Design an enzyme around this catalytic site. Structure first.
Site, PDB file in Angstrom:
ATOM      1  N   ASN A   1      52.255  34.578  26.088  1.00 56.50           N
ATOM      2  CA  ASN A   1      52.926  35.513  27.047  1.00 56.50           C
ATOM      3  C   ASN A   1      54.310  36.325  26.096  1.00 56.50           C
ATOM      4  O   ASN A   1      54.536  35.974  25.087  1.00 56.50           O
ATOM      5  CB  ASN A   1      53.659  34.699  28.260  1.00 56.50           C
ATOM      6  CG  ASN A   1      54.444  33.436  27.855  1.00 56.50           C
ATOM      7  OD1 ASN A   1      55.292  33.371  26.873  1.00 56.50           O
ATOM      8  ND2 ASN A   1      54.294  32.358  28.891  1.00 56.50           N
ATOM      9  N   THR A   2      55.185  36.945  27.206  1.00 60.14           N
ATOM     10  CA  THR A   2      56.011  37.736  26.390  1.00 60.14           C
ATOM     11  C   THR A   2      57.478  36.843  26.800  1.00 60.14           C
ATOM     12  O   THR A   2      58.528  37.478  26.913  1.00 60.14           O
ATOM     13  CB  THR A   2      56.090  39.143  27.289  1.00 60.14           C
ATOM     14  OG1 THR A   2      57.373  40.088  26.529  1.00 60.14           O
ATOM     15  CG2 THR A   2      56.394  39.243  28.605  1.00 60.14           C
TER      16      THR A   2
ATOM     17  N   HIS B   1      42.199  36.964  44.051  1.00 59.29           N
ATOM     18  CA  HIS B   1      43.106  37.877  44.914  1.00 59.29           C
ATOM     19  C   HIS B   1      42.431  39.119  45.648  1.00 59.29           C
ATOM     20  O   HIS B   1      42.919  39.976  46.034  1.00 59.29           O
ATOM     21  CB  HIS B   1      44.475  38.308  44.379  1.00 59.29           C
ATOM     22  CG  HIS B   1      45.361  37.282  44.494  1.00 59.29           C
ATOM     23  ND1 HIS B   1      46.565  37.325  43.651  1.00 59.29           N
ATOM     24  CD2 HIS B   1      45.357  36.095  45.225  1.00 59.29           C
ATOM     25  CE1 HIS B   1      47.120  36.000  44.041  1.00 59.29           C
ATOM     26  NE2 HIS B   1      46.435  35.237  45.088  1.00 59.29           N
TER      27      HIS B   1
ATOM     28  N   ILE C   1      43.852  42.648  40.382  1.00 58.45           N
ATOM     29  CA  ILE C   1      43.093  43.417  41.629  1.00 58.45           C
ATOM     30  C   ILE C   1      42.613  44.601  40.919  1.00 58.45           C
ATOM     31  O   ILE C   1      41.836  45.425  41.508  1.00 58.45           O
ATOM     32  CB  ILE C   1      43.525  43.424  42.699  1.00 58.45           C
ATOM     33  CG1 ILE C   1      44.747  44.262  42.783  1.00 58.45           C
ATOM     34  CG2 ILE C   1      43.816  41.981  43.495  1.00 58.45           C
ATOM     35  CD1 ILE C   1      45.315  44.584  44.369  1.00 58.45           C
TER      36      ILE C   1
ATOM     37  N   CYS D   1      33.038  44.178  61.428  1.00 57.95           N
ATOM     38  CA  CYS D   1      32.015  43.427  61.184  1.00 57.95           C
ATOM     39  C   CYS D   1      31.999  42.541  60.077  1.00 57.95           C
ATOM     40  O   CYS D   1      30.881  41.616  59.769  1.00 57.95           O
ATOM     41  CB  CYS D   1      30.756  44.497  60.949  1.00 57.95           C
ATOM     42  SG  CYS D   1      30.816  45.277  59.476  1.00 57.95           S
TER      43      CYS D   1
HETATM   44 ZN   LIG Z   1      31.676  47.137  59.862  1.00 51.57          ZN
END
Ligand SMILES: [Zn+2]
Length: 257
Positions: free
Chosen positions: A238-239, A121, A105, A132
């Site tokens: 990968n590790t 994600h 992210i 809203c």
């Molecule tokens: Zn709003």
């Protein structure tokens, strides 16, 4: 088989799916909040990335995400991110497709130059109004003035305990609703629209890469096995089909040359 055998598949692959994991962000020094060093103050990150924790203490949840947004200022994409981005640019001019499906992210794939990006994600730099529903980009430091100087990772730090009115508020005219980070929390589903895009990429790919995570662990578990069941080769970086051990900033510049 070997790297030479992978390059043969890679030279002929016309639609590559890259499943990007936490390892890729950890290599840029990005704090993951999983494992033993996945702690912020006196709570587990799992304890904070929940609808329940946001309902009971939105100020503490916002202090946590404010920290995560602020640490990104000093973080840069690594050689892994760069090799992934350059690969998409180069193969795109040859009419071949490269798509990155990430659980991260932090937006480092976006800073490195990846265009075909699926952030399953969400993102630290996106808010969603709880009133809203509007989703918006937000790179402001601090996100709101009451969060200025807050979010210290050290345990012992007192709660900023900001009144809900002074936490990030929606700027759409006449709304002013309470904003939340636009990330998937524990007990929440992935956006069905994002899931449809993902399903479509997996069904049309002729090569699949799992980087900074493994195929036997979530979310790469919901994605990479059904690709391997179609016959399509899966390479894991990968590790810890093809498998390549080591940092992604080492194995990817080479594999994706
Ligand atoms: Zn709003």
């Amino acid at each position: 088989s070997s790297m030479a055998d992978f390059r043969k598949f890679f030279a002929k692959a016309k639609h590559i799916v890259i499943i990007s994991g936490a390892g890729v962000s950890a290599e840029s020094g990005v704090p993951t909040f999983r494992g033993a060093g996945g702690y912020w103050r006196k709570w587990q990150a799992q304890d904070l990335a929940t609808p329940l924790a946001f309902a009971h203490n939105p100020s503490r949840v916002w202090e946590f995400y404010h920290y995560r947004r602020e640490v990104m200022g000093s973080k840069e994409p690594n050689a892994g991110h760069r090799a992934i981005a350059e690969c998409e640019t180069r193969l795109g001019k040859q009419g071949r497709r490269v798509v990155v499906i990430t659980q991260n992210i932090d937006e480092l794939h976006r800073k490195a130059g990846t265009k075909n990006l699926l952030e399953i994600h969400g993102s630290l730099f996106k808010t969603r109004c709880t009133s809203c529903g509007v989703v918006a980009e937000n790179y402001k430091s601090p996100i709101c003035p009451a969060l200025s100087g807050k979010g210290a990772p050290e345990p012992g730090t007192q709660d900023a305990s900001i009144p809900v009115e002074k936490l990030p508020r929606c700027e759409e005219a006449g709304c002013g609703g309470l904003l939340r980070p636009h990330v998937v929390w524990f007990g929440e589903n992935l956006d069905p629209a994002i899931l449809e895009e993902v399903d479509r990429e997996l069904a049309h790919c002729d090569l699949c890469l799992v980087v900074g995570t493994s195929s036997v662990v979530y979310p790469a578990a919901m994605f990479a096995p059904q690709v391997a069941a179609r016959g399509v080769p899966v390479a894991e970086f990968n590790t810890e089909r093809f498998h390549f051990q080591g940092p992604c900033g080492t194995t990817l510049p080479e594999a994706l040359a």
